Amino acid sequence: LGGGSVRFGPGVAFRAPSIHG
C-alpha cells in the first residue's frame, strides 16, 4: 500500500535516468 516507497533496497527500481545518473 501507499504506492512506491522512498526508502528501498537495491534493484531495478530506481529514480528516472538523471543527467548525472
C-alpha to C-alpha distances, 10 to 3, 18, 19, nearest whole angstrom:
17, 17, 20
Degrees to nearest 5, angle at CA 10 with 6 and 16:
60
Residue 19 φ/ψ, nearest 5 degrees: -60, -45
Are the CB atoms for 21 and 15 separated by under 8 Å? yes
The answer to whether the Cα torsion of 20, 13, 1, 9 is positive or negative is negative
Q: Which amino acid is at 21?
A: G
According to the entry, how was the structure determined? NMR
